[PDB]
Amino acid sequence: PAYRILKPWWDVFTDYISIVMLMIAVFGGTLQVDQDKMICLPCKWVTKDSCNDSTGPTGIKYDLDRHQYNYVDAVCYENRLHWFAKYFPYLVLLHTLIFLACSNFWFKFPRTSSKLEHFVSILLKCFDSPWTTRALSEGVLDKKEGEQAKALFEKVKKFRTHVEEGDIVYRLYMRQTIIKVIKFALIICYTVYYVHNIKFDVDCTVDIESLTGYRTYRCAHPLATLFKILASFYISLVIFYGLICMYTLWWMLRRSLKKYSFESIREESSYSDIPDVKNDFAFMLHLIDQYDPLYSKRFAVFLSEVSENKLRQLNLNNEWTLDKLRQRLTKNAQDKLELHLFMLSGIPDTVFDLVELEVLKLELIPDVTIPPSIAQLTGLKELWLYHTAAKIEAPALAFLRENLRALHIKFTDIKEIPLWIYSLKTLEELHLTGNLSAENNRYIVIDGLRELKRLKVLRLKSNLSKLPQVVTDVGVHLQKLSINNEGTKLIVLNSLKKMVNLTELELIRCDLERIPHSIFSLHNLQEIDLKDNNLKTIEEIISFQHLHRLTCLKLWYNHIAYIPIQIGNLTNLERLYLNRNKIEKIPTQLFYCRKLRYLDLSHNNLTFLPADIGLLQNLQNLAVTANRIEALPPELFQCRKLRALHLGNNVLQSLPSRVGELTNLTQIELRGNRLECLPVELGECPLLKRSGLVVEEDLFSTLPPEVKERLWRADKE
């Protein structure tokens, strides 16, 4: 049935020859069972046990009964008739049974039968698959059809590992063919030698003279000529069977069937990655070629991994649809429409169809080739290639050079960094993450930064020990340089004096423990955040007064244990974020900077909060969370511009009613502390609401019911 594909012309020929030979066996067997007799007539005159062969003719009277004649027939049939004439049909039937068993042994042996059935199934359902037609012919595919196509691909993938290792089917077919050919040789020897013994006239000399009276009888075998022509027909059929088996043996010898080359298939078709198959898989593929080569032509489609990549791309273009991706679109801190592609095989075309995209996140996309359809991403300005090597061509390169402006490349290898990122004209923001210190590549791969003249932001989370000179030549046009070294001292040597255009030097985790002179040598820095620079004593702040541009000096995450009075020189400061430190106290002279608008002192060791806070009339958010302030001074409430009061987790005994003076206060952190009760004057603040007033439920319930209702109504609306 299903194995007709695996039976070539020689197998069909041998099967039909075996059927005809079995018919001969059955016919001869029935004849030899029913009508096989031996009519024997005694010789009247004998000479030394041999018939002498010595007025109308009269019959010879033998004086023998019918039963004596039957006895003579039985004795001479048993004794003198040759064994070949008696057992020709049974020997023929035995030979046909042996031939049929040899031909069908590999269809019944479970070890080869399992492989044969698996091969037949995964080649036939391969044959009727539509993916074969679509691939050999070379947008949208049916969901069931695509799932089936990938299922048969995986099934072929496991079948190749399950069969190619072994050669049991090939060896079994070899052994069956060899046994059949030697059986044919034995038959065509013995049958031809003994076929001449099927004679009509047989002399019998059986010595039954004491029971019959005669010794020699001239018998006659009736089915001798018919058995002779049956034997001749059987010999002819065995000759044909043997010639066919020798052709099969010669076919198996000349061409190595333990190898199969798809060279003809891979040249006619575009797919040239079809591998050369070997062993049993090669053998049954050769058999299928003997049946019909176009079956293997279609079967070679699933053997090429280029077809796998095409099918995976098409299925990804279907699995990720434009609709689901419209929901996938989110927004970042910069309020930019963005989609995060995590573990994707490539970029779906549905992703590139999107035109409102601002930030495309190619994160962990294995070796994806960027197609020119990125030109559809007209709004595309931000690409974050996170461990994603981007393969690109000329039109997509031109579109990115003319459109793309910010590029945050995160890599773990030099090869992960693409070389085309240095050819973009409009790039202005560039972020690197990953160690850059290497042999014969230290600050040489980025030598293409000179081509990039629009670069303004250069973040290097590269654990680098020194700033590269190419970045120093770039710094003529660079306005922002943030270095992250993760606790590695960067060798300054006052080498940052070249970047006179630098505006925001954010040394993140640089572990400098000192301020080099290059920080206050350049005149263009407004914001200098020495995050985790581990500066013990903040002593270089006198020279920062020449920095008229400096308005944001964030000295957080340091061992500053005391603030010298000298900071009173710097009157231009606004966003002094001095949090997460061990400041024993901020002094009165610290409040000499009346321009301070944003002041962060959270997670500090303050003794208290002084009165000169009344000087800072521009203060908006004062943050002393988890510091040591026992009582809130009224001078804190003297200022009216407070907006975000991070006062939680403190030892504030009580909040004075003077908070009712505050109107700009839209949020105040009051959770924890030693707060006895919340004053009713908190309801006087218009901008404050429930989300703004974060406090424990019981302390909030200490307020009168109606003012709480007012706050609730102002909150929900």
Ligand X SMILES: CCCCCCCC/C=C\CCCCCCCC(=O)OC[C@H](COP(=O)(O)OCCN)OC(=O)CCCCCCC/C=C\CCCCCCCC
Taking CB within 5 to 8 Å according to partner kind, which of a copy of itself, ligand X, none is near residue 414?
A: none
Closer residue to a copy of itself, CB minimum distance, 80 or 442 = 80
**DSSP 8-class letter at 546:** G
Angle in degrees, CA 407, 509, 551, rounded to 5: 80
Place of tokens 């029935």: 30
Q: Report in angstroms the alpha-carbon separations of 406 from 131, 360, 412, 456, 467.
A: 41, 11, 20, 10, 21
**Residue of the chain from 24, 75, 219, 528 that contacts ligand X (CB under 6 A):** 24
The span of 31-39, 380-388, 536-544, 561-569 binding a copy of itself (CB under 8 A) equals 31-39
Q: Determine if residue 603 is left, alpha or beta; phi over 0 gives left, psi from -120 to 50 gives alpha, anything else beta.
A: left
Least distance in angstroms from the C-beta of 426 to a copy of itself: 13
Based on the shown chain and the rule CB under 8 A, indicate whether residue 501 belongs to the binding site for a copy of itself: yes
Based on the shown chain and the rule CB under 6 A, indicate whether residue 23 belongs to the binding site for ligand X: yes
**Rounded-to-integer distance, Cα 424 and Cα 380, Å:** 14
Closer residue to ligand X, CB minimum distance, 174 or 224 = 224
Continuous segment of H or E residues that includes residue 203? strand 201-205
**Rounded-to-integer distance, Cα 622 and Cα 615, Å:** 13
Based on the shown chain and the rule CB under 6 A, indicate whether residue 701 belongs to the binding site for ligand X: no
Least distance in angstroms from the C-beta of 85 to ligand X: 9
Based on the shown chain and the rule CB under 8 A, indicate whether residue 7 belongs to the binding site for a copy of itself: yes
Closer residue to a copy of itself, CB minimum distance, 225 or 412 = 225
Least distance in angstroms from the C-beta of 90 to ligand X: 4
Q: How many residues in the shown chain lie near a copy of itself by CB under 8 A?
A: 99
**Residue of the chain from 22, 26, 71, 305 that contacts a copy of itself (CB under 8 A):** 71
* Of residues 679-708, those binding a copy of itself (CB under 8 A): 697-698, 701-702, 704-705
Based on the shown chain and the rule CB under 6 A, indicate whether residue 229 belongs to the binding site for ligand X: yes
Chain breaks in the chain (C to N over 2.5 A) after: 54, 138
Q: How many residues in the shown chain lie near ligand X by CB under 6 A?
A: 15
Based on the shown chain and the rule CB under 8 A, indicate whether residue 2 belongs to the binding site for a copy of itself: no
The DSSP string of 108-167 is: T-HHHHHHHHHHHHHHHHHHT-HHHHHHHH-----HHHHHHHHHHHHHHHHHHHHHTT--
Continuous segment of H or E residues that includes residue 504? strand 504-508
Least distance in angstroms from the C-beta of 686 to a copy of itself: 22
* Of residues 214-233, those binding a copy of itself (CB under 8 A): 214-215, 218, 220, 222, 224-225, 229
Identify the sign of the CA torsion 672, 675, 680, 686: negative
Closer residue to a copy of itself, CB minimum distance, 134 or 580 = 134
Least distance in angstroms from the C-beta of 67 to ligand X: 21
Based on the shown chain and the rule CB under 6 A, indicate whether residue 412 belongs to the binding site for ligand X: no
Closer residue to ligand X, CB minimum distance, 87 or 107 = 87
Site string for ligand X, 88-127 (x = CB under 6 A): --xx--x---------------------------------
**Rounded-to-integer distance, Cα 400 and Cα 420, Å:** 10
**Rounded-to-integer distance, Cα 202 and Cα 542, Å:** 140
Closer residue to ligand X, CB minimum distance, 96 or 503 = 96
- Asked if 568 and 541 count as a contact pair (C-beta separation under 8 A), the reply is no
Taking CB within 5 to 8 Å according to partner kind, which of a copy of itself, ligand X, none is near residue 294?
A: a copy of itself
Least distance in angstroms from the C-beta of 101 to ligand X: 13
Closer residue to ligand X, CB minimum distance, 18 or 248 = 18
Give the alpha-carbon dihedral of 402, 404, 405, 410, to 10 degrees: -140
**Rounded-to-integer distance, Cα 449 and Cα 278, Å:** 52
Q: 553-591 in b/e burial notation, b at 16+ Cβ within 10 A?
A: bbbbbbebeebeeebbebebbbbbbbbbbebebbbebbb
Continuous segment of H or E residues that includes residue 233? helix 225-254
**Rounded-to-integer distance, Cα 601 and Cα 582, Å:** 10
Based on the shown chain and the rule CB under 8 A, indicate whether residue 451 belongs to the binding site for a copy of itself: no
Based on the shown chain and the rule CB under 8 A, indicate whether residue 147 belongs to the binding site for a copy of itself: yes
Taking CB within 5 to 8 Å according to partner kind, which of ligand X, a copy of itself, none is near residue 82?
A: ligand X
Burial (CB count within 10 angstroms: exposed 0-12, middle 13-18, buried 19+), residue 257: buried
- Rg of the chain (C-alpha set): 51
Q: Report in angstroms the alpha-carbon separations of 433 from 46, 360, 464, 484, 677.
A: 121, 18, 11, 9, 49
The span of 148-156, 174-182, 366-374, 554-562 binding a copy of itself (CB under 8 A) equals 148-156
**Residue of the chain from 182, 190, 192, 209 that contacts a copy of itself (CB under 8 A):** 209
Based on the shown chain and the rule CB under 6 A, indicate whether residue 547 belongs to the binding site for ligand X: no
* Of residues 72-91, those binding ligand X (CB under 6 A): 78-79, 82-83, 87, 90-91
**Rounded-to-integer distance, Cα 399 and Cα 350, Å:** 19
Based on the shown chain and the rule CB under 8 A, indicate whether residue 8 belongs to the binding site for a copy of itself: yes
Taking CB within 5 to 8 Å according to partner kind, which of a copy of itself, ligand X, none is near residue 426?
A: none
**Rounded-to-integer distance, Cα 9 and Cα 21, Å:** 18
Place of tokens 């074969």: 132
Taking CB within 5 to 8 Å according to partner kind, which of ligand X, a copy of itself, none is near residue 419?
A: none
The span of 106-114, 228-236, 581-589, 601-609 binding ligand X (CB under 6 A) equals 228-236
**Residue of the chain from 22, 46, 235, 389 that contacts a copy of itself (CB under 8 A):** 46
Token pair of 351, please? 């992703």
Based on the shown chain and the rule CB under 8 A, indicate whether residue 33 belongs to the binding site for a copy of itself: yes
* Of residues 656-675, those binding ligand X (CB under 6 A): none
**Residue of the chain from 62, 194, 251, 592 that contacts a copy of itself (CB under 8 A):** 62
Closer residue to a copy of itself, CB minimum distance, 77 or 99 = 77
**DSSP 8-class letter at 347:** -
- Asked if 529 and 509 count as a contact pair (C-beta separation under 8 A), the reply is no
Based on the shown chain and the rule CB under 6 A, indicate whether residue 322 belongs to the binding site for ligand X: no
* Of residues 513-572, those binding a copy of itself (CB under 8 A): 524, 526, 549
- Asked if 597 and 573 count as a contact pair (C-beta separation under 8 A), the reply is no
Bridge pairing between strands 337-341 and 552-554: unpaired
Identify the sign of the CA torsion 282, 283, 288, 293: positive
Least distance in angstroms from the C-beta of 511 to a copy of itself: 29
Q: Which residues of this protein are in contact with ligand X, per CB under 6 A? A: 23-24, 27, 78-79, 82-83, 87, 90-91, 94, 225, 229-230, 233
